[PDB]
Amino acid sequence: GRFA
Amino acid sequence: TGRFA
Amino acid sequence: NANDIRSKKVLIIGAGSLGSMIAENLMRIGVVSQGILDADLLQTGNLSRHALTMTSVGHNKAAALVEHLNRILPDASARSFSCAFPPESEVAKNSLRQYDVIIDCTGDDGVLKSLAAFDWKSEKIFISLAMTWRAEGLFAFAASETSFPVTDASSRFNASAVFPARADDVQLWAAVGTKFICRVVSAPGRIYEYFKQMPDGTVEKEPHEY
Amino acid sequence: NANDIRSKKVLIIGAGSLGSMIAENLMRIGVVSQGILDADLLQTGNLSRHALTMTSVGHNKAAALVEHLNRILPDASARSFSCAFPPESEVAKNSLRQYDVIIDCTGDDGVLKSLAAFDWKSEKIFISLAMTWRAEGLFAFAASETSFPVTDASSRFNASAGAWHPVFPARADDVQLWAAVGTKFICRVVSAPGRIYEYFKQMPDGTVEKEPHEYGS
């Protein structure tokens, strides 16, 4: 997905 | 100059 | 003071690189009532870009972060949830429903859908924050609704979508993201902003015009 | 390799708000050989804008910071100097002279003067970082000299001179922002050493600008  | 750290 | 985040119960979903740093910042400014939700263990590879240290490696990320947060200020009142979202217990579900501000720091699309399917029972401030994979940019979305608007959030991220992310990159976005959180809670609404960092650490912004 | 900060011995003078966060950032990226110098004790009033926690209240800031840094990586080799700059011991002075990069994070004009009067005995990379009163901006100065150029540094500083707004008192997020920008500044200077001065400003809309302008519109 995205990076967190 | 006011400097803060 | 109804627009002061310090008086709000804040739930942070995801205690990884970004979430751990945002939680620490919020605690230091006085957001003492925090819930931290993360089912996974802290890994040694995480420490290059995390709030915690080797002493938390191998421990649950939420429980370890909460132990740290509660040592920051005398009045800190952080609580850990070591389950995946959503919980199975109706007791746990009701505990999560007590929080006023729901912050997704997972970067996971499945969490966006779970937030939208969860029954929050009342209006919440929802915030989703995540980075691009080299941390060149930050996605920042907020909504004030009874149900999370996954369709709008996804379309914003999609419309916006040079070395591996380092601690300074993530701390930069945790700071920008903390300020974003504070701005949202002070004037809630439907908000989307995409930030980009330059090599010298300057930061440019592109907001969506709703 | 020779321009890689991770291989350098880095001394940070000032283990307060900005210095403690920069030190942590540098350790996480692999700068394992750090010296931390500070004579002051950590107090509860520091906690809202510091890397450390209540467990370090009442401890020397440098000693406590070094204990934290050495828990970040297995090869961390941080060392503390629990004294003011300069130390009185000649053994301590020689220990300080072993560092390659000297970073002033005190915001104290007396420290700048002391940096210039101290005999470093060889060329160093000097860096001076400090924020404005309400953390609206960041002063970033660097030089590669045998003696610290206090007069030029002061000249550059003087020429530039809800509660989330930059025009409000400084909070943890403000200091973390400038510690991040300052860490990037440190890395860029060591990669290409020279006389450099930059002044950064944070804006109400969340953006960050630099003087002189370099990147973007």
Short mmCIF file of C-alpha atoms in Angstrom, two decimals, chain C residues 36-177:
data_model
loop_
_atom_site.label_atom_id
_atom_site.label_comp_id
_atom_site.label_asym_id
_atom_site.label_seq_id
_atom_site.Cartn_x
_atom_site.Cartn_y
_atom_site.Cartn_z
CA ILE C 36 -2.26 2.53 20.60
CA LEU C 37 -3.37 -0.42 18.46
CA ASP C 38 -0.87 -2.84 16.92
CA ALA C 39 -0.80 -6.64 16.89
CA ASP C 40 2.80 -7.08 15.72
CA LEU C 41 6.18 -7.38 17.41
CA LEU C 42 8.89 -4.74 17.15
CA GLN C 43 11.68 -6.04 14.92
CA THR C 44 15.35 -5.07 14.98
CA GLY C 45 15.06 -3.85 11.39
CA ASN C 46 12.50 -1.27 12.54
CA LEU C 47 14.88 0.66 14.79
CA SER C 48 16.56 2.65 12.00
CA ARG C 49 13.25 4.55 11.76
CA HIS C 50 11.30 4.10 15.00
CA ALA C 51 10.74 5.91 18.28
CA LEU C 52 11.86 2.97 20.45
CA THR C 53 15.18 1.19 21.09
CA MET C 54 16.66 -2.30 21.30
CA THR C 55 15.03 -2.77 24.71
CA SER C 56 11.64 -3.09 22.97
CA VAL C 57 12.74 -5.53 20.25
CA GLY C 58 10.68 -8.70 20.42
CA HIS C 59 7.87 -7.04 22.37
CA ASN C 60 4.45 -6.07 21.08
CA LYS C 61 4.75 -2.71 19.35
CA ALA C 62 1.66 -1.23 21.01
CA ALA C 63 2.52 -2.41 24.53
CA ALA C 64 6.15 -1.28 24.22
CA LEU C 65 5.19 2.12 22.82
CA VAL C 66 2.64 2.70 25.59
CA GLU C 67 5.26 1.89 28.24
CA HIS C 68 7.48 4.57 26.66
CA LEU C 69 4.69 7.13 26.24
CA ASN C 70 3.65 6.85 29.88
CA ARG C 71 7.20 7.77 30.94
CA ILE C 72 7.19 11.02 28.94
CA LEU C 73 4.86 13.17 31.09
CA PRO C 74 3.42 12.70 34.60
CA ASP C 75 -0.17 12.87 33.32
CA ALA C 76 0.36 10.52 30.36
CA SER C 77 -2.51 8.06 30.12
CA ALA C 78 -1.71 5.85 27.15
CA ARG C 79 -3.36 2.44 26.75
CA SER C 80 -2.31 -0.43 24.48
CA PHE C 81 -4.45 -2.66 22.27
CA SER C 82 -2.43 -5.71 21.19
CA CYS C 83 -5.12 -6.98 18.81
CA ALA C 84 -5.67 -6.48 15.10
CA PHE C 85 -8.27 -3.98 14.00
CA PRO C 86 -11.15 -4.68 14.35
CA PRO C 87 -11.16 -6.49 17.70
CA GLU C 88 -13.30 -9.58 18.25
CA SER C 89 -14.50 -8.70 21.76
CA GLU C 90 -17.51 -6.40 21.96
CA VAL C 91 -15.79 -5.06 25.09
CA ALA C 92 -12.74 -4.14 23.00
CA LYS C 93 -14.94 -2.63 20.29
CA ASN C 94 -16.69 -0.41 22.83
CA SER C 95 -13.29 0.62 24.21
CA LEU C 96 -12.21 1.80 20.76
CA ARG C 97 -15.51 3.63 20.28
CA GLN C 98 -14.65 5.85 23.26
CA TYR C 99 -11.91 7.65 21.31
CA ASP C 100 -12.65 10.96 19.61
CA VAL C 101 -9.87 11.05 17.00
CA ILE C 102 -9.00 7.94 14.99
CA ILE C 103 -5.58 8.09 13.32
CA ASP C 104 -4.55 5.45 10.78
CA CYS C 105 -0.76 5.17 10.52
CA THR C 106 -0.64 1.76 8.80
CA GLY C 107 -0.36 2.51 5.10
CA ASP C 108 -2.64 -0.51 4.65
CA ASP C 109 -5.65 -0.43 2.33
CA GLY C 110 -7.28 -3.23 4.32
CA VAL C 111 -7.30 -0.92 7.34
CA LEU C 112 -9.04 1.79 5.32
CA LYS C 113 -11.79 -0.71 4.48
CA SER C 114 -12.01 -1.95 8.08
CA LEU C 115 -12.40 1.62 9.32
CA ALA C 116 -15.30 2.09 6.90
CA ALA C 117 -17.00 -1.18 7.88
CA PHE C 118 -16.55 -0.66 11.64
CA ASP C 119 -19.59 0.76 13.45
CA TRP C 120 -18.22 3.75 15.35
CA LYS C 121 -21.68 4.62 16.75
CA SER C 122 -21.05 8.41 16.58
CA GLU C 123 -19.18 11.08 14.67
CA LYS C 124 -15.39 10.80 14.74
CA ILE C 125 -12.47 12.77 13.40
CA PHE C 126 -10.69 10.33 11.07
CA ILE C 127 -7.11 10.92 9.93
CA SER C 128 -5.00 8.75 7.61
CA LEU C 129 -1.27 9.43 7.27
CA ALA C 130 1.32 7.51 5.28
CA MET C 131 4.43 8.03 3.18
CA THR C 132 5.62 7.04 -0.24
CA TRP C 133 8.07 4.16 -0.08
CA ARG C 134 11.24 6.27 -0.33
CA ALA C 135 9.51 8.81 1.96
CA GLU C 136 9.65 11.47 -0.74
CA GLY C 137 6.01 12.38 -0.01
CA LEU C 138 3.35 12.25 2.68
CA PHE C 139 -0.35 11.51 2.11
CA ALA C 140 -2.51 13.38 4.65
CA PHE C 141 -6.28 12.80 4.73
CA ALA C 142 -8.91 13.85 7.26
CA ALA C 143 -12.67 13.55 7.58
CA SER C 144 -15.31 14.27 10.23
CA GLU C 145 -18.01 11.63 9.78
CA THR C 146 -19.91 8.83 11.49
CA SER C 147 -18.32 6.40 9.00
CA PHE C 148 -14.88 6.60 7.42
CA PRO C 149 -15.10 7.66 3.71
CA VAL C 150 -12.81 5.02 2.21
CA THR C 151 -13.84 5.81 -1.36
CA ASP C 152 -12.81 9.47 -1.15
CA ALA C 153 -9.58 8.72 0.73
CA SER C 154 -8.60 6.09 -1.84
CA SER C 155 -9.29 8.40 -4.78
CA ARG C 156 -7.16 11.13 -3.19
CA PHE C 157 -4.23 8.76 -2.59
CA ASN C 158 -4.55 7.34 -6.12
CA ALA C 159 -4.58 10.77 -7.77
CA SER C 160 -1.34 11.67 -5.94
CA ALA C 161 0.34 8.28 -6.56
CA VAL C 162 15.24 9.15 -3.62
CA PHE C 163 16.94 6.58 -1.36
CA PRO C 164 15.50 4.27 1.34
CA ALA C 165 13.72 6.14 4.14
CA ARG C 166 15.96 7.15 7.05
CA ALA C 167 15.11 8.30 10.56
CA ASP C 168 15.39 11.95 9.54
CA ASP C 169 12.91 11.42 6.69
CA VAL C 170 10.32 9.82 8.95
CA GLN C 171 10.82 12.31 11.78
CA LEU C 172 10.27 15.07 9.23
CA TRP C 173 6.94 13.55 8.21
CA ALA C 174 5.96 12.78 11.81
CA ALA C 175 6.44 16.48 12.55
CA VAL C 176 4.53 17.64 9.48
CA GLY C 177 1.90 15.02 10.23
#
